[model samples]
Target chain A: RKQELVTQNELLKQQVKIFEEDFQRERSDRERMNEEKEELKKQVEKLQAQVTLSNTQLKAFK
Target chain B: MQIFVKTLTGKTITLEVEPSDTIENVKAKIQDKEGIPPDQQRLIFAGKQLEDGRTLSDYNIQKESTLHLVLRLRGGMQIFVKTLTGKTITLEVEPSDTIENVKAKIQDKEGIPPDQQRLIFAGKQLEDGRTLSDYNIQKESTLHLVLRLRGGMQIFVKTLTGKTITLEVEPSDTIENVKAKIQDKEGIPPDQQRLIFAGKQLEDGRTLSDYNIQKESTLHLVLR
Candidate 1:
């Protein structure tokens, strides 16, 4: 019974290691996207302000 | 003693001068014959710019040696090589030289091979067979050299609006990786973007250099 338990434990550890590479790659992508999200939002906000200013200037032409 | 001198306009004039003749004296003679002012003329031989006061003997400029005469500008034929670090360094080259010769000279100085160098003149990439003279490279002509990175290559992509933007991609990057990055800039999906180089659509699985993509090469981007 003791030998069976030891072999069972070893098999479980090996199964867990198989997913490690894919997990790390996915983890890196998630982190990169999180960083990009904040930057893109900031860029959009700045452009929105510029568009508003241009609209106000167009009022003069009218 | 006699030496032959060539003008930028392909004029080769032979002059009788002693080995000890000062470059300034030679320039005075050339000004008389070529109609270019001594002050406006630049004399070059054996890849070295001759000083006005130096004698030909001092520089070992011997008989039958060919001297190149080009109009002197503030900093004639300014060649800038940009490092990956973004630092730009200035280099000198003769106006009669071909783009290949300039690349060869830069390789000697920077250890970057000619094949790995993409020399940009005005907005176009230079071809090796064409000479600088053929390009009508003017005085103080600036050549923008982009280096190929081990991991990445710099390429220009043209949009439908004719807007060309330079992008850096990993040499190991497949068309998908590039399209993914370009997707962020152009808002085009990876599959929707068609990347064409030299008339053929690039495959998704191949690396950049695998398609013979070089630095400063232009790729056509179409939404198909």
Candidate 2:
């Protein structure tokens, strides 16, 4: 019975480690996606500002 | 030791057999007691086919172990196979028939090459060389058939930087497959590339269709 307990404990520990590894990998993936989202948001803001500046210069010429 | 014998018609028979007894010897005993012909009886225990030439101890068939008996038909059992697209066909097979024989039958019925036929039973891919009785397939058992993918679909990839590119790939292709192609174009490492299809980040091991990716589908590519 003692031997069986050690075998069971080993199996459970490996399974838990596998689950934890998957969670960490997915967490990192989400972090990268959030980082990309922020970068894209800044690019969109810059593009918006550039369009507004172009419209103001056109109004001055008119 | 006494072993449990289960039949197709919901009956169990317990009988004594020596550990040294071969499966053929036990079959003879069953034939004498139950009137089932030795050739027609297919014995299965613990998901493995009991070969006639091997001893009961070879399979570790212990006392009080349970074995299932599926009788082979004169012609064979009728197997109902359905395709992914709702096409259905019936094929006749015996309990002794192997999975390879089923693939050959599908090749004749569906015109799919034997190499391209993948038969699924109970959510598991049935491998060649194992008999239907070993898998415990009964009369009118439903098996799913899918053709192995060989053709490619043209897909569009849109980068996070807004550059779009077109590439051809098969639905069965892995994200790793596309990442290799992406590496040739962008000079980026495949592991550092993130591929998102239909709003879901694709895994390297999963096939493209596993993510519902199809022809004309646009995938987002970003650096991880």
The parts of candidate 2 lying over 4 Å away from their true place are A1-62, B1-150, B159-162
What local distance difference test score does each model get? 0.73, 0.76
Q: For candidate 1, lDDT tens digit of each residue in B45-156?
A: 8777888888999988777889998886533455565433446667666677688878876866675657556666665667899988888876666555655432124677
> Looking at candidate 1, what is the lDDT of residue B178?
81
Complex DockQ, candidate 1: 0.01
Candidate 2, residue B43: CA error in Å? 19
Q: Per-residue lDDT for A1-62 in model 1, tens only?
A: 89756644543443344346445644665687689889999999999999999999999778
Q: Model 2, DockQ value? A: 0.02
In candidate 1, how many Å is residue B187 off? 45
Worst 10 contiguous positions by lDDT, candidate 2 chain B: B145-154
The TM-score of the first chain in every model comes to 0.64, 0.69
Residue-wise C-alpha lDDT for candidate 2, range B30-124, written one tens digit per residue = 97688565777899997776989899989988888999988875334688886645467878665777898778667656655565566777766
User: Which residue segments of model 1 deviate by more than 4 Å?
Assistant: A1-62, B1-76, B149-224
**Distance (Å) between predicted and true CA of A9, model 2?**
67
